[PDB]
Design a binder for this molecule. Structure first.
Ligand SMILES: Nc1ncc(C[C@H](N)C(=O)O)[nH]1
Ligand SMILES: Nc1ncc(C[C@H](N)C(=O)O)[nH]1
Ligand SMILES: Nc1ncc(C[C@H](N)C(=O)O)[nH]1
Ligand SMILES: [Mn+2]
Ligand SMILES: [Mn+2]
Ligand SMILES: [Mn+2]
Ligand SMILES: [Mn+2]
Ligand SMILES: [Mn+2]
Ligand SMILES: [Mn+2]
Lengths: 315, 315, 315
């Protein structure tokens, strides 16, 4: 069975648009905790991290809000490690995707052998020197990869980071808006990815088979799922900062998470980039939040074929 | 070739929302009969069954309108058997899905070796004792399965039922909202199903290959297709009582029916749960009705690749 | 590498609805040329052909505007051959699909061994005698096929045509609205096609594998892609004269074009049937135009997984 530890991370400064800091609020409001308890789930809420304002945080080169982002990730790393040591699956409600530096870092402190599945339209693997936007939500993976040590300058706020994963310990699914330096890094480091072209070619069934065999083939190990709702098509998750057409369908997102649940190895989860302020209508917001909740419930066992308890229902 | 016998079943008391009794009307209004005649089809309209009101019909335990539902199904069974003895494919226009008790029962009187394909978001397999809603459209399959004799109390209106199918003679496609007791029954009886997870994994092509091989592998036999429009995604069939997101696409529904047509074994068909009152706009209604008509025409040979008569068109 | 020669073909008389003659304009306005230059592309604009009015053009039998259509195609054939002799990939911006007579004809003058991929809801293979509509955009393929010589009357405006392709040198993808005489021609001539039924069965991955192996299996040869935006679902390309539900998705259209790009054999391209006047709203127009531009950029190398130049980005 499996214990869950919820962490709200109401944090937006990895990117410019306000509102993503409300994700933990609208996800809770949608009844996530109660719906989780409805399943097999032993659920503990660790609350919303209080990220204090860092008023003096001028860019580093063109990298924006570095001290704010670095410290939020440092704090979240602390908290995720606590949840993990408490023997629970960490569930980070974001918040922008820069928080993955802290979520994966903190997870890896307790489980260094982890493997990551990163579901996103974007690779989020720019370095401080290849970014053109300066937004740290487009860089988290570069901070985490050991191969890119040497390439990450000393950015204020991140002196606490130690790269904890190798290029062979991450798989991307969903990619369709990748910068040229990012694509170079993928090919140079030999990272495993299923862009939307591969999902089209192979079908999500084969994509998950290969994703899981790639990560678990040699031996089982904890899985970290970092799910950016912008990996799904904007027809399902429109309330997000950077929607990109041609995404994963609602079905594909449930398929990915149902298969990860079935491994019994989910160890940490990020549900990121929900930005209620950016829905064009109230219904775009509920659509987005509802989809995120459904993705989350699938991670913890909710199955489209149905579920039952180990009793005899014919009484 | 193939003769068709249309039966309207303007009946709603298997569930609470009025309007599904108008399905036969809007389907006819959309020109179904004429469009069928445009194909190879020898089409006879048996009219709309006149279901008299049963004013005294208080629940049985929590099961609602049992006498009404039982009698409508009894009457429809009578009529479907007549059509079948007339050597025609029965085409039941519903009406809520509780009518499948009568449609499959009546069909089986003439062809006891039939196999059923049930296309639906729901399994509709609660018994009177596992239902929580009391709505009989969520129970028809339990009345039909021989294995569940012993488990179906004597519900008023259904004393005429005799279970006519075994668990191994039905396949579900489309499932994504299954109650716990229903899931227990599926696993306990070893029923064959393709939930949306399986359709995602395998693709609708392989789903139909396996569906047909499972039902026809040992020997050919008549097929009964019970098609609930809520099996399709609400973006195609919104005017229905219980829409569930993440459904079969329009393409997938045509694929299912094109492959069943190609077997030459379609023997009876139900087109159920169209509820024009529930479209949010006139266009949701026409969208739903149009999709239902297209599904129906595919059952009788309309092919997306095209069709021609056995003449030389280059004259 | 690959040089491109853009040709605008603002022409509508292959069908009744005005507005498709504006396709080259809205595609250019959307920044196509600049976006192409952003890729590897050496881009030369050959301008918009000036199609003079032919005021005296009464139907031939029921075939409408034959002299206008024939002459526009004659002029376009001239220009495409020029671009091809200039060692560039011809990119025809339409305009209605009747222009394919000229585009493929002109291409074949320079590369007679070409193979055609025709992406469309329709086969566009009626002859002047099997058409029921009289619209020449529903006939271009019949004019091009050698096997149908004998079956094409002498239509005024087309005396310059010489059939340049065999039935075995075309593959259709996307088909879902095929007339009976057209279906007869497909089966009689043994043309290779993937209707939407086949795309559903096999998946677009296998469809392209088979399409390319069928055309290139025996030996590499130039590819002509004739892309009718109505091959995509109207939820992506609504501003078109004859939308048909159940089409190829945005993903599938990018998949088709990404795979053709990867062959290195794209030799000519048609982007047809964009009709901005027919969008129900301004957003339907931009949606359609945007999709067409994305399809076009994929033909010339834009990849969803990303792209980089052959430099070291980690500097
Ligand atoms: N949401 C998002 N993630 C990444 C981007 C764009 C770009 N690679 C960047 O790094 O800013 N956008
Ligand atoms: N349309 C529909 N069919 C079944 C349901 C829900 C539930 N299983 C029930 O049995 O009522 N809803
Ligand atoms: N756009 C379009 N192409 C073909 C058609 C319909 C019909 N086959 C015809 O030939 O007119 N419509
Ligand atoms: Mn991200
Ligand atoms: Mn993203
Ligand atoms: Mn049903
Ligand atoms: Mn249903
Ligand atoms: Mn066309
Ligand atoms: Mn077309």
């Amino acid at each position: 069975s499996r214990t869950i530890g919820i962490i709200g991370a109401p944090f937006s400064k990895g990117q410019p648009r306000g509102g993503v800091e409300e994700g933990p609020t609208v996800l809770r409001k949608a009844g996530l905790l109660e719906k989780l308890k409805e399943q097999e789930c032993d659920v503990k809420d660790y609350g919303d991290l209080p990220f204090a304002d860092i008023p003096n945080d001028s860019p580093f080169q063109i990298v924006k809000n570095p001290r704010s982002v670095g410290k939020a990730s440092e704090q979240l790393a602390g908290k995720v490690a606590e949840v993990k040591k408490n023997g629970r699956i960490s569930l980070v409600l974001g918040g922008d995707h820069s928080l993955a530096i802290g979520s994966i870092s903190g997870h890896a402190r307790v489980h260094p052998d982890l493997g990551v599945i990163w579901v996103d339209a974007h690779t989020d693997i720019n370095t401080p020197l290849t970014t053109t936007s300066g937004n740290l939500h487009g860089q988290p993976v570069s901070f985490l990869l050991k191969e890119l040590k040497g390439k990450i300058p000393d950015v204020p706020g991140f002196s606490w980071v130690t790269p904890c994963i190798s290029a062979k310990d991450i798989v991307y699914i969903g990619l369709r808006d990748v910068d040229p330096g990012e694509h170079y890094i993928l090919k140079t480091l030999g990272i495993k990815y299923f862009s939307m072209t591969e999902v089209d070619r192979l079908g999500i069934g084969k994509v998950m088979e290969e994703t899981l065999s790639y990560l678990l083939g040699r031996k089982k190990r904890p899985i970290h799922l970092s799910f950016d709702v912008d990996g799904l098509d904007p027809s399902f998750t429109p309330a997000t900062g950077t929607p990109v057409v041609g995404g994963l369908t609602y079905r594909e997102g449930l398929y990915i998470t149902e298969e990860i649940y079935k491994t019994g190895l989910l160890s940490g989860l990020d549900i990121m980039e929900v930005n209620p302020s950016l829905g064009k209508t109230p219904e775009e917001v509920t659509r987005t939040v509802n989809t995120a909740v459904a993705i989350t419930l699938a991670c913890f066992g909710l199955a489209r074929e149905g579920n039952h308890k180990p009793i005899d229902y014919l009484n």
